[PDB]
Amino acid sequence: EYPTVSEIPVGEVRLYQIADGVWSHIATQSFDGAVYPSNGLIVRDGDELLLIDTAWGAKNTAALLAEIEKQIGLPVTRAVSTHFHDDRVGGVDVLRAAGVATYASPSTRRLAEVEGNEIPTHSLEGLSSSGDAVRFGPVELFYPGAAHSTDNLVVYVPSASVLYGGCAIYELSRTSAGNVADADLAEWPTSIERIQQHYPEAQFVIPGHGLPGGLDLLKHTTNVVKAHTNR
Numbered sequence: 001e002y003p004t005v006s007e008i009p010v011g012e013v014r015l016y017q018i019a020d021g022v023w024s025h026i027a028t029q030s031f032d033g034a035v036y037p038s039n040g041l042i043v044r045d046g047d048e049l050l051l052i053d054t055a056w057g058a059k060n061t062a063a064l065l066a067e068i069e070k071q072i073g074l075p076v077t078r079a080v081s082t083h084f085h086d087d088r089v090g091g092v093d094v095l096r097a098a099g100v101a102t103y104a105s106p107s108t109r110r111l112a113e114v115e116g117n118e119i120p121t122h123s124l125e126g127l128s129s130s131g132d133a134v135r136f137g138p139v140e141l142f143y144p145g146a147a148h149s150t151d152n153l154v155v156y157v158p159s160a161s162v163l164y165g166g167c168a169i170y171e172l173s174r175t176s177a178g179n180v181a182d183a184d185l186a187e188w189p190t191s192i193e194r195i196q197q198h199y200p201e202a203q204f205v206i207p208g209h210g211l212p213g214g215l216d217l218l219k220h221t222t223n224v225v226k227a228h229t230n231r
């Protein structure tokens with residue numbers, strides 16, 4: 001069963017096998033007086049692994065590398081951060097020290113710098129416009145438009161029909177948008193629609209936080225965002 005926030009002590013990382021050669025990683029961290037779970041993705045890349053997002057902080061990201069080595073045993077050689085928040089880039093310095101080449105779009109790298117967050121080393125060209133997609137080894141990176149943040153990327157694994165939505169996709173049990181400081185609430189529904197349109201075959205959809213679902217999470221997230229638009 002998918003691990004929940006109460007089951008993962010802060011500082012520990014779980015891996016969850018989604019499909020052959022595709023895992024999520026799950027960690028926990030405090031924000032504003034509460035502890036939240038957070039997901040990223042791991043994808044087999046030949047004899048290497050591609051990491052999607054840090055485990056939300058340096059200590060957690062170190063535990064991620066250790067659990068990957070214990071459970072999978074192949075080297076993490078590249079990492080992509082899907083936007084500029086700490087649950088996506090926090091721990092990039094650990095990855096760099098471990099020999100991982102870290103990547104983000106130029107938009108993410110600028111926004112991280114303004115915010116004072118860690119900055120991935122390498123810039124991903126080809127993702128500046130809504131609807132843009134690029135191949136990155138075993139995945140396709142997709143920029144759907146502004147949503148949770150202006151830079152948020154989603155990631156699709158074609159070999160497995162896994163869509164990683166990151167923080168632009170809410171888990172089903174989440175009923176309130178909560179903190180939307182950096183969001184674009186007017187663009188979010190249209191960006192979700194571009195995701196649905198480009199990845200209609202997605203069999204698994206992983207939110208940035210909480211339990212996996214299927215494509216129903218997209219419309220779920222929309223309705224939760226519009227409920228904040230109205231009141």
Ligand SMILES: Nc1nc(C(=O)O)c(Cc2cccs2)s1
Pocket residue numbers: 031036037038086087148167174178179208209
């Ligand atoms: N690092 C964090 N990101 C987010 C986010 O919404 O993306 C947080 C708020 C959450 C509310 C419920 C589950 S997560 S905390």
Ligand SMILES: [Zn+2]
Pocket residue numbers: 083085148149167
């Ligand atoms: Zn975020």
Ligand SMILES: [Zn+2]
Pocket residue numbers: 085087167208209
């Ligand atoms: Zn988040």
